[PDB]
């Protein structure tokens, strides 16, 4: 649908920014498996999604900036949640916390979660318990379209 | 004011404190009787719940939220980064461009706006044409709960 095309295109445009400027960030997209719990640790939003929100809520030292934002279908349910981290030897222990807890919340749930490396700036994605790395700006917004919205 | 009211205004006043201490620039709109759906659409709207952690982000220099007035409806915020209307008032024009704006909506509508200026840290407010400055975290309080809440 034209309003889905619209939420892909703020968050992938969101994502991209982030990553140019190498801003870490952290985005959990809800599917089946419902993230409640890790919802009521962050704080609370319930917000429309936007580029600019999407960026402001990780620019470095700022109170939301730290954790997993939580999207809920076509809202932001909460930022700063504090996801579960992988202790999975696969995650390269030069990978950051945000990985860790990417790959934490892909292992107890069916979520998909977008991170963006502060260090490297580079894109990647966990769903079924595995990180996939390094995407490219077209397989995100492919990937996100599909465990979002199913188009 | 109900406990949920309560909450919402130490949300409110905890949040214009921390950018006061700061010297952060804050322009916060109370939408009251007159409808401010025009300016809310000149923003980026947000349907969002109030938190202090929120209203800090959104104002922090350099993001795309902070260029602008936020606006609140109820118990949401409905969007961030508005126009608001600069005074016309010769008398009003001493002061600079948020002051001015925050005078500016207050001309045109019965809404309620929180200031807090970058350059000293002061709490002024808005309403019906009248700027009280440098006003103390009591009396902002105290306030906010008259016009936001009744």
Request: net charge negative; aromatic share 6%.
């Given at each position: 649908?034209?309003?889905?095309?619209?939420l892909?295109?703020?968050v992938?445009?969101?994502v991209?920014?982030?990553?140019?400027?190498?801003?870490?960030?952290?985005?959990?997209?809800?599917?089946?498996?419902?993230?409640?719990?890790?919802?009521?640790?962050?704080?609370?939003?319930?917000?429309?999604?936007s580029?600019?929100?999407?960026?402001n809520?990780?620019?470095?030292?700022?109170?939301?900036?730290?954790g997993?934002?939580?999207?809920?279908?076509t809202?932001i349910?909460?930022?700063?949640?504090?996801?579960?981290?992988?202790d999975?030897?696969?995650?390269?222990?030069?990978?950051?916390?945000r990985?860790?807890?990417?790959?934490?919340?892909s292992?107890?749930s069916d979520?998909?979660?977008?991170?963006?490396?502060?260090?490297?700036?580079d894109?990647?994605?966990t769903?079924?318990?595995?990180?996939?790395?390094?995407i490219?700006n077209?397989?995100?917004?492919?990937?996100?379209?599909?465990h979002?919205?199913?188009?």
């Amino acid at each position: 649908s034209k309003d889905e095309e619209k939420l892909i295109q703020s968050v992938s445009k969101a994502v991209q920014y982030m990553a140019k400027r190498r801003i870490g960030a952290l985005i959990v997209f809800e599917k089946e498996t419902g993230l409640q719990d890790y919802i009521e640790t962050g704080i609370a939003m319930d917000s429309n999604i936007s580029q600019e929100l999407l960026i402001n809520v990780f620019i470095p030292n700022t109170p939301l900036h730290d954790g997993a934002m939580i999207i809920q279908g076509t809202k932001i349910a909460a930022a700063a949640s504090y996801l579960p981290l992988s202790d999975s030897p696969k995650i390269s222990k030069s990978l950051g916390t945000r990985h860790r807890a990417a790959v934490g919340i892909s292992e107890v749930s069916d979520a998909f979660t977008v991170i963006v490396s502060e260090e490297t700036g580079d894109i990647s994605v966990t769903f079924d318990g595995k990180l996939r790395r390094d995407i490219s700006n077209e397989i995100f917004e492919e990937l996100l379209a599909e465990h979002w919205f199913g188009t």
